[PDB]
């Protein structure tokens, strides 16, 4: 296995030095490389229990067994005397830039995964290009470098969530002694958007600076893989050319779907458009029931909007459904209207958007309930959140040989390799993986280290924690209660649960028994915690630390022996005792 | 060991039933006991791997080996036929109330620990009395049932902390688009206090109801242990009497100290007085540098006060000192003044408190710096936070034989037993233990279960997490960096660290590099996490979940393989990489 690792490491590393921390000759080569601004990976054999065997195996490539040994793109370059010879004769720079391809790495897609992968690879001396292009929305919206999260996802949506949370802070401040009168305060949508977009602009610029400072080539051009090593690019002037690369990472993400009904594309919008919208949406219908749909409906209501959500079947399909219903009940008691068991049939235009007075238009929405009854109502804005999909037929010629699944996503091995050996895929287009920004970043960083620095660590996709930033937030890690019961049987599942009330809500006169948490446990495995669920303020901060314990195999007993921090919401996890089987009430 | 456990369980349980879940005779005895309102512990032998051996050992007390077997205060009462005989002849109630003492348990002290212990014991049939008396402060302040945390500690202090946090929420709301003008809003101290005190009143009442519903005798009287089983009580009319109890739990807590200088007791106040103060303190000097001192100074500043803290040597002695300095720097940049290396010599009265106009008085404070230079300044309120101490000479006759340490706290074994075999001590008076409310509650609950239900689990006092609720909060679990280095040597310690900026602070234009976190790790033990530290918003919610992982022995690798939740502050722990040895900057 050592010999098989060494061959794979030597073949794919761009520039790599085998060394020992105690060798003055290695130190001498390091200095020359640093002085010449030659970036490289380094493996210190004296810090690996496998080092003696590795030192012996190197002779299979170089015919020597000593350190240092420097390699460039699979070719042994020399020991100390030889590297310094190339330096002194001004031959070293041409040797380390010698390649069959233009780039060691081409990343198609400049988002969460692709930027992480490209920056990490360049750190070990891989000559890297990152391609990013943003196809405009139907109404023309576009944005800068960074991907979906930075521009039209996690970042603007949580900032708008905070704007909505501040409405309750203003209400609570009177009870805590502050002299303001909440009923005389209003919200200005365009002032919010200007502040959100200025932060996003600082992120766009930060990414371009980071790529420049890592010597990464940034091309604002649409990429198409036409053979295993050839990428056809089209720039902003429609000029077409081809570049070559040794390794390819596909990281192109997804975009919103529209339903196939009249008026949807013409007159509706999606989350792509919402976060830079120049006018307040007004009376708004959200079609869909995903976390995107409920998060946007939630902050629109808190900012004073008249908001309706149209639900085809259930809320948050794929999440614990007891928690999903508690999430929606809270929203429905705090202003959000729901049209349940309902789908749309067409959108008709009554008024065109007023681009000069900065005002929305007006629409008539016609639909029907599952029993056949009719839906008909007017709205100023209609937002579709009915899922997201990739469009890899635009990215990937089918003759290259990259296998896709029934949904159009890329079938990968557990090290992100596609069915073409030099081509990898990360992020939302990787079939079967959780579609989250921290997953894409970890996958891209770890992959770059395996390709160019001889690392072995894989990304672990199991028990990845999540948080839904609805007006009352919902954090989770592990299995839903119904999934656990399906897998192991009701008799082997124990559920501990409790309501709770944040101390902050007492003087503010908020609700007694709305926040809720539970632990879903396996009796026959020492009461292993299979899933953790919490509905309450700051739910993502609450949940995150427990993700480490669950990764380590925490049991109910581990939660019991750990002491709480008081006063907090999170401490309620350390003293749970009421079981669902007992029938005892969970109320405070 | 089984035989030794069984004897200890039988001797101390008040009412206990040995049973099996599948026995209809046991079910029949259970029903009779439930119908007669006889509370008891129950041990189901079929759910213990030790059950066959226990069944054999019971015959050493009862001369029978079958189930059910019912015991009262160490005496075997009968099997099925015999218990039903006593029931039918109306003899059972007198048998189960037969005792050498008035009470199975007397708890001296009605606070966090004592209330928890008393309620848990009563659940297993122990006849329990809880004694609570609140000696008034020098100026006359007193309060109701619940102890220091409920009335003059964690609960009011965090509610006042929230009042102060809402001042920055009001400032931030303008940047997020809300139409308020922060500079025209003021705070009303007395309106805040009225709301805080109404919540506290609901807790006082909740505890009296809970004791009544658990059949616990509540005596509002001062207790004194005069022999191992005799408690002398003095009531509100100065009437003196004696009650007896089998087991005794001491849970009397501590009170604030005053420095031995002229004017301190006469003219200053402490945290005991602050949380119900009828007037705003005005220009305020806080003498001390504990977490109590900095927490009170912090919210007083955020509520508009002119506040000075006088520091004898260092801030937060006993906590990580890099974190302590970051905590104080933030307070000093946000309005709190510090007089460093300074102690007071006297307090002189210039104006008496105006009880009718609802106004503070005025004082002249004279002190000196450690180099000899003089301090002299006028303040309206002077608050001493220079530590807390017990006064067990008032609680405990020295002839009883309970050993105290040099600081006046009770020397206990690892099951909370004192040097007198039937007397135990929990909470802040237990020598050497962390002085926190969740520790006192766990100790009291677990102890009651060992005494009266045959449990074996001990309280684990190691690696208990904490949070200091200063204006920017500080959470910690495990060793400080300097303690880790002292124990293991600098060469064996690695520290990963990073600054961070909450997403909420970006649009609000708050500081870039003030929030900070670090992990203190042991190289020679697989990079075990010895301590975790975080300075930022919601630090107690952040820290709590990680306490479970640290209890389980988490390593740096466990933090690395766990994926973050985005966008959160807590996720920064999952991607730490900059080491202190590297010298690389931790800034964003
Ligand atoms: C509204 C919303 C809210 C979300 N909130 C969260 C949240 O709170 N937390 C969380 O963890 N995740 C959240 N997500 C998910 C997160 O945004 C994604 O998981 C993440 O952005 C996926 O990263 P990626 O690298 O796979 O792709 P992306 O970030 O989508 O980047 C792909 C990039 O490649 C570009 N591209 C596409 N085709 C080509 C081509 N042919 N040539 C060149 N460039 C191309 C795209 O235009 C895009 O810029 C949210 C998503 C949405 C829609
Ligand atoms: C300002 C402040 C803030 C704090 N904040 C926190 C925080 O955020 N988190 C945290 O975990 N901890 C906090 N603490 C600590 C916490 O309050 C204590 O650890 C906890 O209250 C100790 O519980 P106890 O049962 O040991 O005693 P106590 O809660 O002090 O209860 C003892 C009771 O017994 C009574 N008593 C005394 N003598 C007698 C007698 N002879 N007869 C009858 N009754 C008697 C006392 O009057 C009192 O009512 C704080 C403390 C202070 C002072
Ligand atoms: C997951 O949610 C549900 O399952 C509930 C019951 C129903 O079947 C679907 N549903 C809702 O539409 C809803 C709206 C507000 C609260 O719940
Ligand atoms: C547990 O975290 C996940 O992301 C899970 C993992 C699994 O693959 C299905 N899944 C999701 O559908 C999801 C949640 C939010 C966006 O997608
Ligand atoms: C623990 O704190 C310290 O150690 C610093 C340095 C000094 O020795 C003590 N000290 C402070 O008084 C202080 C005030 C505001 C920030 O720090
Ligand atoms: C780690 O948590 C603790 O409480 C530690 C444990 C240790 O006994 C010393 N100690 C304290 O002095 C302390 C902190 C807050 C109040 O007291």
Residue numbers in the entry:
A (entry chain A), B (entry chain A): 6 to 593
Recite the paper's sentences:
Schistosomes survival relies on the redox enzyme thioredoxin glutathione reductase (TGR), a validated target for the development of new anti-schistosomal drugs. The S. mansoni TGR (SmTGR) (EC 1.8.1.9) is a homodimeric flavoprotein with a head-to-tail orientation between monomers. Like all mammalian TR, SmTGR is a selenoprotein carrying the amino acid selenocysteine (Sec597). Paired with Cys596, this residue directly participates in enzymatic catalysis together with FAD and at least two other cystine pairs (Cys28-S–S-Cys31 and Cys154-S–S-Cys159) with redox activity.
Here we report a high-throughput fragment screening campaign of 768 compounds against S. mansoni TGR (SmTGR) using X-ray crystallography. We observed 49 binding events involving 35 distinct molecular fragments which were found to be distributed across 16 binding sites. Sites S1–S9 were observed having multiple (> 1) chemotypes bound, while sites S10–S16 bound to a single fragment each. The integrated analysis of the experimental X-ray crystallography data herein presented with computational analysis and literature data on homologous enzymes strongly supports the identification of at least two druggable sites on SmTGR, i.e., sites S3 (‘doorstop’) and S8, the later described for the first time here.
